[PDB]
Amino acid sequence: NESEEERQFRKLFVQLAGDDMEVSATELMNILNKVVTRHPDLKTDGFGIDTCRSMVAVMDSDTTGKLGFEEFKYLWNNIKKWQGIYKRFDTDRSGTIGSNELPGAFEAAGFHLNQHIYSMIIRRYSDETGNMDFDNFISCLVRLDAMFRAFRSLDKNGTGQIQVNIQEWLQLTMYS
């Protein structure tokens, strides 16, 4: 009752974990470094482990270090959008987006901040060359996504503010 895609992966799931249906980082790293690392329709070595550990974290509410299939499915779906936005901005098919394209690709991605933040995010995900590989482009969007989702979860009413004690602050920022 779901995109033929998802139900295949699922195999990779049941093979690795059984009825648990969950996947470690490094395990999940593989699975992704396959759909997207084979294909020369897109240039990229593979997703970093770190990148990978983050995907898991922002989507683990049980603090077990495992990504559930349902959650996997949410992640993949934005992952395949953000696929869209990648290629659509890597003209040179360099395996990077040159600095000046990012902020488009980003606003593209649904997240709209200002210059002041992009002058930081860029300055923090790019290389010395100031360009962000795919790895980084995805990793970022994974974060941003989750810090945005975090705030919604902590502002259910409407105030455009959240208040966190210290435990909340470190759970929400250490597991990220």
Q: What is the DSSP letter of 37?
A: T
Residue 107: both structure tokens together: 């606003």
CB of 134 to another protein, least distance (A): 16
Of 76, 75, 67, the residue nearest 20 (C-alpha): 67
- The region of 8-16, 33-41, 88-96, 139-147 touching another protein under the rule CB under 8 A is 139-147
Residue 48: both structure tokens together: 């970093």
- The region of 31-39, 83-91, 98-106, 142-150 touching another protein under the rule CB under 8 A is 142-150
Distance CA 102, CA 106 (A): 6
Select 6 or 87, whichever has its Cβ closest to another protein: 6
The binder of another protein chosen from 5, 7, 8, 20 (CB under 8 A): 20
| Residue 127 annotated in ligand binding | no
- The region of 12-20, 31-39, 78-86, 87-95 touching another protein under the rule CB under 8 A is 12-20
Contacts of 76 (CB under 8 A, 6+ apart): 5, 6, 9
Beta-bridge mates of residue 67:
23
In the range 72-111, which residues lie near another protein by CB under 8 A?
Answer: 74
Examine residue 151 and tell whether it contacts another protein (CB under 8 A): yes
Q: Which residues of 122-133 are buried (b: 16+ CB within 10 A; e: fewer)?
A: beebbeeeebbb
Residues that bind another protein (CB under 8 A): 18-22, 24, 26, 50, 53, 57-65, 68, 71, 74, 113, 117, 120-121, 123-124, 128, 143-144, 146-151, 153-154, 156, 160-176
